[PDB]
Design a protein around this nucleic acid. Structure first.
Ligand SMILES: [Ca+2]
Ligand SMILES: [Ca+2]
Ligand SMILES: [Zn+2]
Ligand SMILES: [Zn+2]
Length: 295
RNA sequence: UUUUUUUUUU
């Protein structure tokens, strides 16, 4: 099951790929994959610049090996790194899994001259589900998607230097920077087990692949993107959702957009209770007893 | 103690 498979994936060690010898081995491993989760860490810039800064790490985790590769592009140089990786990134027969591909794909194209093919954006997948059920086009962050899809609740000094300096320029990278960089692709690969090939997910993977391909066409143009595809960063263009996914949904009980029948305040009519602690006024997903980290 | 309760990526 996806739940037991998740525990294995979360134990995958990282491996820094920072020499030509290490790179050849990593490429050979990824060459045998069917799906490769990808992520990028880049030099932090200023708030105004939307483009990623200079690529520092490209992270990969595939179904071919229980490891997270941390490609040290800064040390290898882009020229060395892209030599054989470009063919794999361009191979439509290997699915590349992202969580918000937009900035990543822009950086791959601008900085590396590579345009991936066979891409599936799991953040978009999750949004497309919310769109079909509720006419919601919000992009949710990794933490929210992890909790809602896999029930998982997933470091500091990295966030301290980051949110508040390039950050990712220092070499050697401290262990906790490497582990920080390693985390997302583990989560991406495990999330794919829940979202992809799940008969009971109500959006077709092919539809989301096509929608993701549109994002790659928009953002992988060999130069910084002028006009964003989404009206604000934390949403998915409604017109693209209408085109690739279909009409947005709403509550079967009251007809409103934004929620489903199972969540309807009107159908619950003041009588619903938290399924964990039993009190009125909140859901199990947001219960402070079940989830004290929400206090 | 709670709302349709959310880190878009870096
Ligand atoms: Ca990312
Ligand atoms: Ca990341
Ligand atoms: Zn309703
Ligand atoms: Zn509760």
């Amino acid at each position: 099951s996806a739940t037991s498979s998740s525990s294995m994936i979360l134990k995958y060690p990282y491996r820094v790929v920072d020499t030509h010898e290490k790179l050849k081995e990593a490429v050979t491993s990824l060459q045998g994959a069917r799906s490769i989760a990808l992520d990028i860490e880049a030099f932090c810039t200023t708030d105004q610049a939307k483009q990623l800064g200079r690529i520092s790490l490209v992270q990969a985790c595939s179904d071919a090996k229980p490891v997270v590769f941390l490609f040290d592009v800064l040390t290898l140089t882009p020229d060395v790194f892209v030599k054989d990786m470009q063919s794999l990134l361009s191979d439509r027969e290997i699915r590349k899994l992202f969580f918000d591909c937009r900035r990543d794909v822009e950086a791959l194209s601008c900085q590396l001259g590579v345009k991936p093919e066979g891409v599936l954006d799991l953040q978009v997948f999750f949004t497309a589900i919310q769109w079909k059920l509720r006419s919601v086009n919000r992009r949710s962050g990794m933490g929210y998607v992890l909790k809602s899809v896999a029930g998982l609740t997933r470091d500091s000094a990295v966030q301290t230097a980051m949110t508040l300096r390039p950050v990712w320029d220092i070499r050697p990278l401290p262990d906790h920077f490497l582990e920080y960089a390693a985390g997302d692709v583990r989560h991406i690969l495990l999330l794919s087990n829940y979202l992809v090939g799940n008969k009971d997910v109500p959006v077709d993977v092919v539809a989301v692949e096509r929608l993701t391909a549109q994002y790659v066409e928009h953002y992988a143009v060999g130069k910084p993107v002028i006009t964003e595809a989404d009206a604000t960063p934390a949403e998915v263009n409604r017109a693209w959702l209408e085109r690739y996914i279909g009409p947005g949904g709403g509550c079967h009980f009251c007809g409103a957009k934004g929620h489903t029948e199972a969540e309807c305040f009107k159908k619950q009519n003041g009588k619903a209770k938290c399924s964990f602690c039993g009190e009125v006024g909140h859901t199990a997903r947001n219960c402070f007893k079940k989830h004290p980290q929400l206090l």
